[PDB]
Amino acid sequence: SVNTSFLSPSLVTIRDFDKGQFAVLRIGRTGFPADKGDIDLCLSKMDGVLAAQLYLGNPREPGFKGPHIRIRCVDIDDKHTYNAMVYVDLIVGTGASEVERETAEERARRALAVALRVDEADEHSCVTQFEMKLREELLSSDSFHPDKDEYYKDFL
Amino acid sequence: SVNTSFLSPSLVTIRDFDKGQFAVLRIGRTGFPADKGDIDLCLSKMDGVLAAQLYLGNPREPGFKGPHIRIRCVDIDDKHTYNAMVYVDLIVGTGASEVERETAEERARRALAVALRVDEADEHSCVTQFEMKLREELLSSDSFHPDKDEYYKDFL
């Protein structure tokens, strides 16, 4: 269902088969061992990215023209106050005009800010921040997948 | 019983304790994330290699002088048609004659071609090929194991 693996005390891979997501959990600042609360926090943020995707469209629709909101990594800062940086990819089709990518970017930024609860502390008592990476891909290409392992090279 | 770990979205280690196997699942061509169907496909091919092994002898027999067929990796190509490449090691004794090696070589290739369903869509609608690497090892040595981690360096 959810496959979790410790590549190191502070580096964890989380693969959700039912939700079709892959995310890297790292305790970046302190290098402390990830506990169950850290994994639950990452899974919570992974769920939030799923909700923000629905603000742009339904990815299960056949012939989905995007754009895609894909979580990549949840970096947890637990030195002083409890903080989480959520790295997300926004993927728009290559045939999108410049206005269409700025609109998609602002629609994604607004939805993620609410879905990830950035303006306050969440249920895990965590101050959440996120960072988006804008990508352009030919969404019809047979070599494209929203969670291609290339997109995770900055975190593995 | 079966321990599965994601080292990356497209790189998975699979350790089967009951069957005494270890296999590296990788989605090589596309780099797409491994889903349940890919893991079931890999576990299916690991099962087939065990069946092919029985065509040459019972490995649990005490004093088994080989030869061994050991699976090492399953490389899945899902860009267009669902294909898989199964990397296996044929391990024969050091003092084996040339006729004994060629015989074990051809018996293994006949058994693998049937067990892996080569050149046809198998149960998971996957067309399979296999690549066999011959090895000569000291089977009676205390330092020998059919699944030494040095045999997995090309895939990890």
Added chain:
Amino acid sequence: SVNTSFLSPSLVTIRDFDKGQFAVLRIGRTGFPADKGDIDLCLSKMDGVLAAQLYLGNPREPGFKGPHIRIRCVDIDDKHTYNAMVYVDLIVGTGASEVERETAEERARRALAVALRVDEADEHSCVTQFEMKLREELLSSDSFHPDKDEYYKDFL
């Protein structure tokens, strides 16, 4: 509540959430695949280091001034006889008086010898030895954790 991951056939990460430990299991000498007996042997030695820790003080007490004993790696030698090397850290506060360091050092060697059953066959028919690395940390620092991932670099 124990997360086990195979980075390689002979390299395993074991994360005990309940006991709050992280240990690296490796079949160092032979490179053989780790089986359940190896993981049980590792989990048993992780249990022993926990018992040895209680001989110096309860780490759950508030403002615990140390010393800490932390398991880092269990290196199994299964070539001939069943042997295990247990790499542990001894973390002492930086404000010690060099006499308190050797007192904590001697106390740790005595407790680890009994807890790990050194130079005798345990329940798993394993002859155990250990190595203790002495460390100095400001235990009141917010960037200190007894299992900080930098402590595991020699084994991962």
Added chain:
Amino acid sequence: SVNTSFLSPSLVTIRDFDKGQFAVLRIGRTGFPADKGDIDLCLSKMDGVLAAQLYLGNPREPGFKGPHIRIRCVDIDDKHTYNAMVYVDLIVGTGASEVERETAEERARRALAVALRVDEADEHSCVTQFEMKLREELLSSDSFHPDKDEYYKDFL
């Protein structure tokens, strides 16, 4: 056990296998659809004829010389008040004298008046009357049955 079939909205055949009876329920005067209350009323009158038969003799006795009381049709009049006319057949042996016949008539008519509850509201608030047809049959004949289908011509 009781097969009930509608030949028409106001014509029902009722076959009781366990009690060896066949009766024709019809809503004669009005032609209204027979409801569950009419069928229960018909089954209750079939019960009474079976009790009245036992006042004359046990029909399951081997070599039973009769006489037989056999219900044929229950004709319900539900226009104003709730009435029912029960049509029964009294079957005496062919070799019986006149005095034997008229005695069998009185014993059956007097018994039917109590079993069918003539001239009074019964358990179904129904005022019941009966009509008896005398027949003389060789009871030992192999072509005789107390419920021959010819005995039902006038009602089917």
Added chain:
Amino acid sequence: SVNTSFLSPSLVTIRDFDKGQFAVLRIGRTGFPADKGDIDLCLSKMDGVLAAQLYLGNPREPGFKGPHIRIRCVDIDDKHTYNAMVYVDLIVGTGASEVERETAEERARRALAVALRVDEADEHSCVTQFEMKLREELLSSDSFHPDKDEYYKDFL
């Protein structure tokens, strides 16, 4: 509850005690044996006539001045495509004027067209048409019933 009887392979009487209905199912065109699907369709069309009745008024109201809409026969044409002709009776009071008569006719024709799914495939993939006979009866007469068996002589 529902009493079903086969007068012939293609002629079935259906008596619904709980809903107070009586219908004659017949496979008129082909004479094929009525199967479970044919009976389920007939019960479905009888169900629609009850619904169409409620559009005209609640029949269980004390002193119901009508009109009554009562199903009589469902003739199934299953030669090529699946069709059903539903013969229904519209009963209005004798004192109804000619304006009230046609108003009742069209009000019931509208309701029947919807409830019986006229000229479209219904739940049973059946294209249904209906035919309506107008009757005038003194509803307060003690000899009147909406489902008098005389009304069914065309179909029995």
Added chain:
Amino acid sequence: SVNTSFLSPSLVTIRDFDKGQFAVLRIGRTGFPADKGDIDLCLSKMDGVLAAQLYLGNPREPGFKGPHIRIRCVDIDDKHTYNAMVYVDLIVGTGASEVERETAEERARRALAVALRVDEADEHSCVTQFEMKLREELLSSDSFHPDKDEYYKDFL
């Protein structure tokens, strides 16, 4: 499952929905009421007719070219010894040659003799006889059904 209706004391229609059969039970010679033993004997003969059909072919085969063996009536003679006459129809496809017609007729009579247990007491202590009527039909016609109600006019 099986719909049994009494049209008269000695005339019963039997509709087997699950086996797709229709038969008419009648107690011809005597006119006696049909008891459960008679209905059990009838259903047993319909089961035997179903077995004789399988000797000629599988009717569930797509594009079945025939021939068909179909039961129509079981006439029970219970005056002296217990006897039954089973009326069946043999339906060969139109254009059948004289040889195909005679081959189908004899294969039918041979299979019916065994399945119906002719000239011998069966499980119900009954001596069974049969009578076969030949029919020719365009089997691929939409107006054809092996149990058309016209085929039963001789017995209803």
Added chain:
Amino acid sequence: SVNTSFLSPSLVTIRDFDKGQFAVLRIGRTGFPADKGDIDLCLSKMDGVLAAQLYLGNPREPGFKGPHIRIRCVDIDDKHTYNAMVYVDLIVGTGASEVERETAEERARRALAVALRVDEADEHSCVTQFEMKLREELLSSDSFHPDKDEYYKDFL
């Protein structure tokens, strides 16, 4: 509750704890092994002696002045017909007169004749006869018991 022991194939001791009886079963004339039927017959005659005892008086009555009637042995003759000889003891008080003695003698014989079903086939198709031995004992003596083991010497 009932302890059965085979001293030989045809010599069985039956001890009834609940009824406070002891009987010797012997298959005398033939020496055949005692089967379950023979043992059931013995238990039946032990019941009859107990039933004949209650005809003389309740022995559980405090200060019971007798007479006692005790079964000693059932000798089964199963050569041709099925017969049994029941040996019983009649114990009267030593202080009783000859009139009381012979009166108890005649009463016991009358009761035994009915209880043991003498000279007629019983429930087990056995023709029973009995033999009564008169004894006189001081019924209040501490060394008296109705089933004193000396009373069985003729049968053990």
Added chain:
Amino acid sequence: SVNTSFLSPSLVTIRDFDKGQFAVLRIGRTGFPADKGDIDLCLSKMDGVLAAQLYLGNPREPGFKGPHIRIRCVDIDDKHTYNAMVYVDLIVGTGASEVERETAEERARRALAVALRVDEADEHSCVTQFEMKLREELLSSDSFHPDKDEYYKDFL
């Protein structure tokens, strides 16, 4: 079912009602107390004699002309190695010819050698021997029973 009685610490009678056998168990050489193992061994040898009988014939066949083979005694020598001597009777019909007697005698010996496992140590680790006593009886006589009690006089 199986009645077991200790006539002495070393002398046991075993009566099997269901299998219709009687056997004497004795610990002859040593006089040791019989334990459950000795009794289980005796029951096993009793079971083997039943099996050996079927090689000669079915004794339940009416008019069974024999030969009968009946166990009588199991004598256990447990001084040193565990041994048993099985005393059986071979009962052939009176008037048997010399060849019929010898043929029946050799057939019983062969069947017993396998059934009693005289060659090796059986399931109970016992070395079994047997001794066969030949008897001739009028099998149809009312005074004959295969387990007549006098056949056991040498062992009781």
Added chain:
Amino acid sequence: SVNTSFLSPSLVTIRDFDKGQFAVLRIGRTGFPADKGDIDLCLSKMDGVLAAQLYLGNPREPGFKGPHIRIRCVDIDDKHTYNAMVYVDLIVGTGASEVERETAEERARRALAVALRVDEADEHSCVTQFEMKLREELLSSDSFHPDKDEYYKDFL
């Protein structure tokens, strides 16, 4: 687990398989039949002998050099007050000096006096006596057993 048999009304053999004991129960003085209370009393005294044996040593110890306390017979005197005479055997090794034999004799007396409750009335309101018989045996002999049947000849 406990096999009791009645050789006579007052003579009972009791074999305890689980506790490895044999005892003869006899109601000697009066010859009265044994009841469940007598058998329970015997089993209690047999149990007390097991406890007294443990005062001298554990008989399950390998190479147990004795001495043995073995119960033989329980003789119940129930004429006046409830009395029991317990016959036990004391078996010392044949190579025992006169001092050792007298010490074992006194030790066995003290233990048996407590275990058999000879001082007071026991749980069954029975004043207990016992009588020891000194025996000398070669305990390593293969023909020795603590409960050899010859040891019971005085009571059977």
Added chain:
Amino acid sequence: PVIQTFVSTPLDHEKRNMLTKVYRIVTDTILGKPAELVMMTFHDSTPMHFFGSTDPVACVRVEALGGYGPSEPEKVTKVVTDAISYVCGIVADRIFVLYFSPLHCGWNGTN
């Protein structure tokens, strides 16, 4: 003769009896032997693999003392495969019918 019916699908009283009646027909008409001398055993819900799947599949074994007529096996396979398909819903190309002939056959205690 003896007819063993192995199917992967479950069987009940109705299905076993239908195959029984058909098997009686096959013996009397095709095999030329009495219909009552047929011993029929049924083994339903048998774990069976065939043609790369465990889909419904049948294996019917026919044993007849004295061999078979020149054209009899083909007629048996036709009727049996038709009967199994109609009764069990097993497709035709998943129904094996095997024909054997025992060296001897004992019945009523004699050969």
Added chain:
Amino acid sequence: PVIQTFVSTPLDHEKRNMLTKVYRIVTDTILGKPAELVMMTFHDSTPMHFFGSTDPVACVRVEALGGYGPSEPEKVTKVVTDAISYVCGIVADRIFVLYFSPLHCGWNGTNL
């Protein structure tokens, strides 16, 4: 040799072992082969129809490599029919005994 016992009645431990001992006798004396080399399989409660009824019925399949002697199959049927009748209560006219001889038989990994 291999012997398969198909009975429509239920078998228990006592019944199977009784038939086992008889089968071991049959192999050693009649078939002239070691009694340890006999593999016996039992299949109780088998749905079986025979002679127009489901009354108790048995089918015993005998497989012996190398065939049988001149009078051996007759003797085997006599003993097997008697044993099944005694053990299971099945009548003799409802007991089949089939004899086969496999082309080859493998044991201990060798087809010899």
Added chain:
Amino acid sequence: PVIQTFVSTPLDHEKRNMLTKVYRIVTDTILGKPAELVMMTFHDSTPMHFFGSTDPVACVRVEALGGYGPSEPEKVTKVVTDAISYVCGIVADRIFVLYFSPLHCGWNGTN
């Protein structure tokens, strides 16, 4: 071909599938027949007595139309015995492999 596996030990989905893939290899390599054309039945937990014990034991029945080529039965026995030993844990000296050849075999309604 038809292969019946009788074992006294219970078989699950994994064990039946492992024996399934092995017999497919045996059919193709040794028997030289299509691997999809071999029908394979399994009968686990069979009450079996052999060599004076009810210890784990197996009997495999191989039926092939047209007989067997030279050396083929010895090869099949080696692979089947190895496979049964690995899969079921049954020792080699308690594994029978019987070889038969039916007179005729029916499939898809024709022989």
